[PDB]
Amino acid sequence: AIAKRLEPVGKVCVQG
Amino acid sequence: AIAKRLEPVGKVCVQG
Amino acid sequence: AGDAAAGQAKAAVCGACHGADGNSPAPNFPKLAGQGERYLLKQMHDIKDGKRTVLEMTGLLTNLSDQDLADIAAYFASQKMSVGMADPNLVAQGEALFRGGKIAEGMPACTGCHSPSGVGIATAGFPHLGGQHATYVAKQLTDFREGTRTNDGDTKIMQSIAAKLSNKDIAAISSYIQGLH
Amino acid sequence: AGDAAAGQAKAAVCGACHGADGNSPAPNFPKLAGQGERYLLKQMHDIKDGKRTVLEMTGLLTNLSDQDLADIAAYFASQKMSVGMADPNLVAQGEALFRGGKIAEGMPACTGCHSPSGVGIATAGFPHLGGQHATYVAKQLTDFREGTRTNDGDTKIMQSIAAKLSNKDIAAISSYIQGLH
Amino acid sequence: QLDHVDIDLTDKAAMQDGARTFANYCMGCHSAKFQRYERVATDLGIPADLMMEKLVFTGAKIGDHMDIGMKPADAKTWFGAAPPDLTLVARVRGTDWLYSYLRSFYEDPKRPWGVNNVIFPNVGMPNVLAPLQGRQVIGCKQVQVVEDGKKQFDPLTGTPLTHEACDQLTVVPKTGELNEAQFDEKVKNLVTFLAYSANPNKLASERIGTYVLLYLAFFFVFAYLLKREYWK
Amino acid sequence: PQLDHVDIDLTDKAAMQDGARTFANYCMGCHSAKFQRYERVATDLGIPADLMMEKLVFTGAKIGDHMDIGMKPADAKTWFGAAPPDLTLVARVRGTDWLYSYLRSFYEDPKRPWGVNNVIFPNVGMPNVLAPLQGRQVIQLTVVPKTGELNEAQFDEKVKNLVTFLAYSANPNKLASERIGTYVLLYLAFFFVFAYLLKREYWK
């Protein structure tokens, strides 16, 4: 619950 | 006199 | 403000290098899709006036008027930049640099002026970065570091910021930005 | 310790690239004349064992024993490095960096480990710099900065120091070192 | 004219969302250097590992201050004004001022960063929450009709009775991730976290003060009796 | 160890100027003098401010700045195995005789990391940075002939001037201290005469 609340805004799409 | 006494050790050759 | 509808027609010549919608397929050509209209217009004016040197664009903007440039910038800003993929071996370092900067060296994080998601600030002219080609982003960071690109203004925002990035840092952050969204 | 007399005969093959007396004519080849014997021997052994990669030297030291390398190093140390000229447009910045380093960035001045005149410290293994080819010094600083050259030890002395040098800083300091004596 | 916001410092979830917003959208330029990640995690109820993974982007330790890489002098040169440290900004400006300021950015081409602020006119801050709020402009929109404080709501639906006004902050539709209520909640959580950061001892202060006042009332009873008696 | 005595003269402006030159060129590479300012050194040594900036300020600092250096203590401690201490107060920490014997006691010792050892400071982490001037000194200490710019007397004079500058740096107030103390003691003797006479008069 806290982890979802604290998710960083920037999402990076990575190879594999 | 003082200027000679304080001359930096490192001497550099320069083009022209 | 420019007209995206007319910019689409006026941007056909550009689509040869940047792609029809502004999502260039080749890494060395930047993606203009989704880029801030203010930033796009500033870059096009700089290239017209020689403030930014793009040899591949020699004479392409000379015949385009201010309204044509505004229309093209609006058309490209009306698109969506496709998101690339970050190198797994570099994504950690690039992410750390982008989100945190360097406290010790006093380098800012990129998440302030460019959003945490890399969308930039369109009104402020801070360019969209997320999804931009890693090769192009690395080239721009190198050019800022060496002073090759100086159209960031007298304040030298990006010249100063890139002065603190090593080549490995530049590569890692470019790879991270390529996949950032 | 090595014997300079025998080293002269043993060092003839090297003179093709580094010059008969160790004062190489070509900028890309380092001058070995007047270089510290300890530093020369360390570099020879590092190139032999792969700690330092010199493609042009591939296999040249494989057949040379420890005594032969010591003799060659002693011969080259007995010589006197020739002094080049510094670029007038770069001598000021290079001199500033060499003598004062960077207070703000924490980069040391080079006059400590390398003498104020660039003669190095022979006993400590700190190489003689003054009069070395500007191109070679720039390449060495670039390799240290990029981690290409890592034979400076676990302390990473020169890697750490060169991490703080920009390309312009490297160019200016290399020119000054070439003119230095 | 500021807008009131009811900030609940006992809401751990709201403070957590505010901390996430601050760490992502604000610590790019603003430090919270008088405040440690460890204390923020302890007070917000965030596990230390979770705080490390989710809110510490600068490579700092858990016990380190919320410092950022952007130096005040560099940022003053770049923006025209140094982004102040935001640890105490809730105390410096108040929570209502912050709530109104972070929701009052509107496009203004005459300005260096293309935006201005109703609360902080000619502010040097770029509108960094534009992606969330969306494009906000000084235009015409429906505002509740008021006549000398006579505020009209709809008796049946309970919604305001509105008339058009052309000097109002209006968000251009479909320009931001969050609607007006969602951005209001985001800004409320951020200002709640800033209020906590400015005064991290508030809740403990209230508890300790309650106990102190109870003890002092007890002691006052005894001292008053010892006085009135012995004064006979 | 047994130290060599050196008579340090803090009134010798020329000697202190030569010592400042040697410190700026050969010692500020690794050592800071961060507790003194270039301006005060220039004023006390009789060096004009422009001359001081041109000849002794290599770091790009202002005349009024502390004599800081780029080499950070942590990096130097990593590199040399020991941090080069700030030398502003070293003449008070060690004394001028110890410094004079130490800077002349470097000899070649291959077993050591930097190829040298010191009689005064065994197993010291300093590289022999004055080897170009003194020459190759080997073990009793003897200098290999035709290995340094200076002979024994010239190098002794160089080290003496450097140690004199270090002594001034440790105690920049010594000359003013003596000048002021002379007058203070004269006034105190003058006042003692009056106080003693007053006490004698009252105690009759």
Ligand code: HEC
């Ligand atoms: C979360 C998105 C943020 C919040 C909340 C705040 N900031 Fe900023 N900011 C920036 C600058 C250059 C300034 C100075 C402008 C000026 O002085 O004219 C500011 C100012 C503020 C203030 C005003 C504080 C005061 O006492 O007046 C507040 C309350 C504030 N900021 C809150 C720049 C930036 C920035 C760089 C792009 C970012 C990412 C943020 N600000 C983020 C936030």
Ligand code: HEC
């Ligand atoms: C190939 C012949 C090109 C055509 C046709 C157009 N552009 Fe381009 N452009 C090209 C390159 C190789 C680059 C990158 C330069 C560099 O420094 O690496 C660019 C760059 C731009 C930019 C800057 C993008 C940014 O900073 O994010 C803009 C705004 C731009 N180009 C606009 C533009 C327009 C309007 C064009 C049609 C009139 C156009 N480009 C054509 C190569 C080529």
Ligand code: HEC
């Ligand atoms: C050309 C085919 C070469 C011959 C013949 C020899 N060397 Fe060389 N050397 C060469 C290059 C291009 C370089 C520089 C490598 C780099 O990283 O840029 C070198 C370098 C050295 C060094 C290091 C000198 C220094 O300043 O650190 C040493 C000690 C050295 N080489 C020794 C050496 C000896 C003993 C040789 C004969 C057996 C010899 N070199 C031949 C190219 C060439």
Ligand code: HEC
């Ligand atoms: C880097 C190449 C150095 C330069 C140039 C000089 N010194 Fe140094 N010094 C250096 C180190 C790493 C150390 C510590 C050695 C250890 O084992 O602790 C020192 C130490 C000294 C000292 C000793 C001071 C003390 O122990 O309190 C003195 C007096 C000293 N150094 C003097 C000195 C002088 C006069 C120099 C210029 C001639 C000089 N140092 C240069 C590293 C380096």
Ligand code: HEC
């Ligand atoms: C504060 C303002 C910053 C911050 C902290 C960073 N950048 Fe960015 N940047 C900024 C501006 C004003 C501009 C526009 C420059 C111009 O008008 O010519 C840029 C631009 C870039 C670019 C070029 C984008 C493109 O060519 O499409 C890149 C690649 C870039 N910036 C990267 C970058 C990185 C990696 C940062 C953190 C290390 C970073 N920026 C921070 C302003 C600012």
Ligand code: HEC
């Ligand atoms: C003290 C530690 C220093 C500092 C302050 C500087 N250097 Fe130098 N350096 C040092 C060592 C121990 C070595 C040997 C590296 C090895 O064993 O491989 C070097 C070497 C160099 C070289 C290589 C020269 C050559 O290949 O012949 C160069 C070019 C060099 N160092 C340059 C340099 C510069 C420009 C400095 C100031 C910015 C500098 N060094 C400082 C030790 C030390």
